[PDB]
Amino acid sequence: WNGMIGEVVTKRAYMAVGSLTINEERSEVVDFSVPFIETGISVMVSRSNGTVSPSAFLEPFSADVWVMMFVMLLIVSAVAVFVFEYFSPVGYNGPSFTIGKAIWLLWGLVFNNSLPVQNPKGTTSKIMVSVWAFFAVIFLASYTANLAAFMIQRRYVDQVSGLSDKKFQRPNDFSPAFRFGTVPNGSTERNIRNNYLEMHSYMVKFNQRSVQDALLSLKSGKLDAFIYDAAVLNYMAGRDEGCKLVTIGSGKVFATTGYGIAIQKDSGWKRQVDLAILQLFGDGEMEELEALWLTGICHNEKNEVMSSQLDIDNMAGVFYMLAAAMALSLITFIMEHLF
Amino acid sequence: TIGKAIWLLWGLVFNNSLPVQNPKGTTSKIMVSVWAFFAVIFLASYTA
Amino acid sequence: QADMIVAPLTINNERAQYIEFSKPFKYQGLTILVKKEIPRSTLDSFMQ
Amino acid sequence: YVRPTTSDGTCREEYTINGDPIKKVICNGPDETIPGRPTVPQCCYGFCVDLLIKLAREMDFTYEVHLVADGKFGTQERVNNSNAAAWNGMMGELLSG
Amino acid sequence: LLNSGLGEGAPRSFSARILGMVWAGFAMIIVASYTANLAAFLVLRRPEERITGINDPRLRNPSDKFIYATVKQSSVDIYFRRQVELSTMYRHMEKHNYESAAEAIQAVRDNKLHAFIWDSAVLEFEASQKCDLVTTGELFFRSGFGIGMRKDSPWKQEVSLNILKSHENGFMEELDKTWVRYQECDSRSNAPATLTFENMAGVFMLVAGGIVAGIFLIFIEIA
Amino acid sequence: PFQSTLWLLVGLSVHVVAVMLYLLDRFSPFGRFEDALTLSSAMWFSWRVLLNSGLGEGAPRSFSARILGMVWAGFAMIIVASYTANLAAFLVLRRPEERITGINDPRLRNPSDKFIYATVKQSSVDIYFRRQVELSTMYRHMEKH
Ligand SMILES: N[C@@H](CCC(=O)O)C(=O)O
């Protein structure tokens, strides 16, 4: 072992501070005590795995507006056809001709006029067209207001319930490039090295140097993911110039640790020193120093992300449903041609 | 054609309302389609 | 009859002044939020 | 508000945007364009001027307004000026002469 | 007005043309105002009856009608005893408190108490289990929960190494992963389209009333 | 907010429906003249249901064009209602994406060389920053320049 910790072995440093996370190596070569602040290993970018946001058009339906619309179409078509469309005792093709035109008339009234088709003669049917048109404009107003109100809500990349995903085992999964790394010669290199051999062997080819180079790489577009300490990510992401990138979630990180001190031989104060830390929580200095030195710039409740519109992936899905209806109409055309 | 044209355009601006009729030339149908697109865009910007 | 406590107890100077304690495994704070209520109507027959 | 005297007479007479005559007083002040500090007779008018006119008409007395130049910080004797003593000549700023 | 379509002619007179133009404009005004009030109802202003953040100003001021009853005889009394800052509230919050946790958690949900002062440790479990409460975002007055042993016990270093190795391999991620169930609600205004069917049914019953009224109309017609 | 390839796909769907209306009913092969009949009429139907137009001469009798016109009108309502929702979301323009804080800006206590908080030199602000004792570490930074 070498570095600054050797100063504790050479009897040239009775006590030392800094970024010293408690773990087995520091507690193995020398002694330890209680950390004053907590931290851990975290990712600079959010937990999304490059997943595309889902569609927001079929979400308000939830397989309910189409089913209830079909049932209402059946009862409205039936009760609407057994009142004035069936006046004389006819055969089976009689009411069917009024049903085929009635469903197209109602469909024309739902989707905002579209096709006037025609109009009957009875005034009660005209009143029914007026009421159905009122339900059509009310359903349209509630559809545009509900869809817009749902669009104003949070629809950005949502966090997933998977920490160790495909990028922690096999590197050849994602076809587009996705670079990720950390600063060598540290606790993260030995922890990830002892926990994930593939991530280390695939990570040594992408190494950093400092923090400004990583910020320039993430700002330009050279680096994709960045994994480092939680405190450096809170101060780095906190002191941002545009408040674009954000950490994973809002404070839920793995591997809980903290920055502590290291002494040579347990013979002086030590214990009382720990009580000194216990005095800090008794004086409220953690809030003043936390809001004074540990603070940043982007501290305006980072919980919602909104911008412009992503890959019409939703309209592409609606187009896929239109292709499914096209195939259904093709099979229907085959069944019609077979007869 | 002006008296019916202004009423047709007024019908297209306020969302169909009355279909009235439609001529035969395809250029008038294309211009009516563009006027309907600008009409529903103006309606969307008006409601928003 | 007690040798070691597995309950997540707090760490203070009055308690740790006469006994040795280990490092905490989870740092959590105190909150004052109880519950929230969202006002809405279930029937919703407009004209309100 | 300090405004230079137009032509070679007294102040410029005007009105406000609500229908009320504005009063101006005579005030001698320097100029920032010329490197020197000459006695430039100008006309002052504003909130403190109207307040000075009100306090001047509510009490039977005469006054004379004058513009102050540079030196608006109490004059803190901190620059080493020859290794000698000093004396308070500002701070409050009211007793010059 | 109701936007209907037949197709049999058009008003040739200019008076009915201008009247129909201003009438269609009035229809667009009332439907655009109705839709605007619908969107204004969706969002809601609500942004009221919320909390403060790291320190609620209502805690420093004493209140008789809104008692902040907390857990009696616990770590909160030691925290309120070893402090010096909030000393004008320990006398008010010292009296009228419950010495049981289930009585307080059951009291704040069974309409009894106004509020409670307790850590989010049990709050996140009872809120993530009973689906009746919700936690906040900030965590003011942070504390640590450790294990205390005797000073003459040499096993504290071995157990400490077992805790460190237990947090280095990933066993804590399995415990917290299998003991923290992420259940549904996260904010008071995050999903405004989870109902819909009731809001549409409340008008559907009026549509059925219009169908019965239509049966009355055809009853007048056949008469 | 959306690339031109999306509208190109919308027009591509118009071509798919246009050739679909000709593929359904039987007619004759026609690359002989300039203007057709069922092709121009089918295009007038596609632009009639998509952009919501209205003529009055009849109605499609076949059920295939009925279902295709129903799902096509539904797609039109989806794109115009979704586009309206994108317009309202564009006019929401909610994003103060900026601010000072309130009674005490945390950026004032933290020193910064790229955003200098210059003030009036030699005035009452120097006396206020001199008689204080709280924010004393910033008097050296704000004292110069
Ligand atoms: N504290 C670490 C550096 C920060 C990190 O863990 O990334 C070390 O001294 O090696």
Swiss-Prot record, chain B:
Tissue specificity comment:
Detected in oocytes.
The segment annotated Pore-forming runs over 4-23
Q: Which domain of life is it from?
A: Eukaryota
The chain's Cytoplasmic topological domains, given as residue ranges, are: 24-30
**Non-traversing membrane segments, not crossing the membrane:** 4-23
Regions that span the bilayer: 31-46
The listed locations are: Cell membrane; Postsynaptic cell membrane
Concerning its family, UniProt says:
Belongs to the glutamate-gated ion channel (TC 1.A.10.1) family. NR2B/GRIN2B subfamily.
State its role. Component of N-methyl-D-aspartate (NMDA) receptors (NMDARs) that function as heterotetrameric, ligand-gated cation channels with high calcium permeability and voltage-dependent block by Mg(2+). Channel activation requires binding of the neurotransmitter L-glutamate to the GluN2 subunit, glycine binding to the GluN1 subunit, plus membrane depolarization to eliminate channel inhibition by Mg(2+). NMDARs mediate simultaneously the potasium efflux and the influx of calcium and sodium.
Domain description: A hydrophobic region that gives rise to the prediction of a transmembrane span does not cross the membrane, but is part of a discontinuously helical region that dips into the membrane and is probably part of the pore and of the selectivity filter.
- SUBUNIT field: Heterotetramer. Forms heterotetrameric channels composed of two GluN1/zeta subunits (GRIN1), and two identical GluN2/epsilon subunits (GRIN2A, GRIN2B, GRIN2C or GRIN2D) or GluN3 subunits (GRIN3A or GRIN3B) (in vitro). In vivo, the subunit composition may depend on the expression levels of the different subunits.
State the name under which the record lists this protein: Glutamate receptor ionotropic, NMDA 2B
What's the gene?
Answer: grin2b
Section covered of the full-length record: 598 to 645 of 1448
Curated annotation (Swiss-Prot), chain C:
Q: For binding glycine, which residues are annotated in this chain's numbering?
A: 8, 10, 15
Domain of life, per lineage:
Eukaryota
Instruction: Name its cellular compartments.
Output: Cell membrane; Postsynaptic cell membrane; Postsynaptic density membrane; Synaptic cell membrane
Give the record's family classification.
Belongs to the glutamate-gated ion channel (TC 1.A.10.1) family. NR1/GRIN1 subfamily.
This chain's function reads: Component of N-methyl-D-aspartate (NMDA) receptors (NMDARs) that function as heterotetrameric, ligand-gated cation channels with high calcium permeability and voltage-dependent block by Mg(2+). NMDARs participate in synaptic plasticity. Channel activation requires binding of the neurotransmitter L-glutamate to the GluN2 subunit, glycine binding to the GluN1 subunit, plus membrane depolarization to eliminate channel inhibition by Mg(2+). NMDARs mediate simultaneously the potasium efflux and the influx of calcium and sodium.
Q: What is known of its domains?
A: A hydrophobic region that gives rise to the prediction of a transmembrane span does not cross the membrane, but is part of a discontinuously helical region that dips into the membrane and is probably part of the pore and of the selectivity filter. The extracellular N-terminal domain (NTD) is a site of allosteric regulation to modulate overall receptor function.
Subunit comment: Heterotetramer; the NMDAR subunits are modular and harbor tiered domains that function in concert to regulate opening and closing of the cation-selective ion channel pore. Forms heterotetrameric channels composed of two GluN1/zeta subunits (GRIN1), and two identical GluN2/epsilon subunits (GRIN2A, GRIN2B, GRIN2C or GRIN2D) or GluN3 subunits (GRIN3A or GRIN3B) (in vitro). Does not form functional channels by itself.
- Record's protein name: Glutamate receptor ionotropic, NMDA 1
The UniProt gene name for this protein comes to grin1
Curated annotation (Swiss-Prot), chain E:
Write out the topological domains of type Extracellular: 35-199
Membrane-spanning intervals of the chain: 18-34, 200-220
Q: Which residues bind glycine?
A: 75, 119
- The domain of life is Eukaryota
Cytoplasmic-side stretches of the chain, per the record, are 12-17
Its function, per the record, reads: Component of N-methyl-D-aspartate (NMDA) receptors (NMDARs) that function as heterotetrameric, ligand-gated cation channels with high calcium permeability and voltage-dependent block by Mg(2+). NMDARs participate in synaptic plasticity. Channel activation requires binding of the neurotransmitter L-glutamate to the GluN2 subunit, glycine binding to the GluN1 subunit, plus membrane depolarization to eliminate channel inhibition by Mg(2+). NMDARs mediate simultaneously the potasium efflux and the influx of calcium and sodium.
Query: How is the quaternary structure described?
Result: Heterotetramer; the NMDAR subunits are modular and harbor tiered domains that function in concert to regulate opening and closing of the cation-selective ion channel pore. Forms heterotetrameric channels composed of two GluN1/zeta subunits (GRIN1), and two identical GluN2/epsilon subunits (GRIN2A, GRIN2B, GRIN2C or GRIN2D) or GluN3 subunits (GRIN3A or GRIN3B) (in vitro). Does not form functional channels by itself.
Q: What is this protein called?
A: Glutamate receptor ionotropic, NMDA 1
Instruction: Record the organism.
Output: Xenopus laevis (African clawed frog)
Q: Which portion of the complete protein is shown here?
A: 612 to 834 of 903
